[PDB]
Amino acid sequence: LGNVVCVTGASGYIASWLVRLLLHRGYTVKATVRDPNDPKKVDHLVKLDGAKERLQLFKANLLEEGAFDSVVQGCHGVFHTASPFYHDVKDPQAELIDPALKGTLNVLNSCAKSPSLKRVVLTSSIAAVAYNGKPRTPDVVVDETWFTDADFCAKSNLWYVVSKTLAEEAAWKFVKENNIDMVTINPAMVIGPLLQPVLNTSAAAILNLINGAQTFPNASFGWVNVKDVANAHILAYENASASGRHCLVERVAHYSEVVRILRELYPSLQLPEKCADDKPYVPIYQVSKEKAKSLGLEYTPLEVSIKETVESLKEKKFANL
Question: Which residues participate in NADP(+) binding?
Answer without folding.
Answer: 9-15, 34, 41, 61-62, 81-83, 160, 164, 187-190, 202
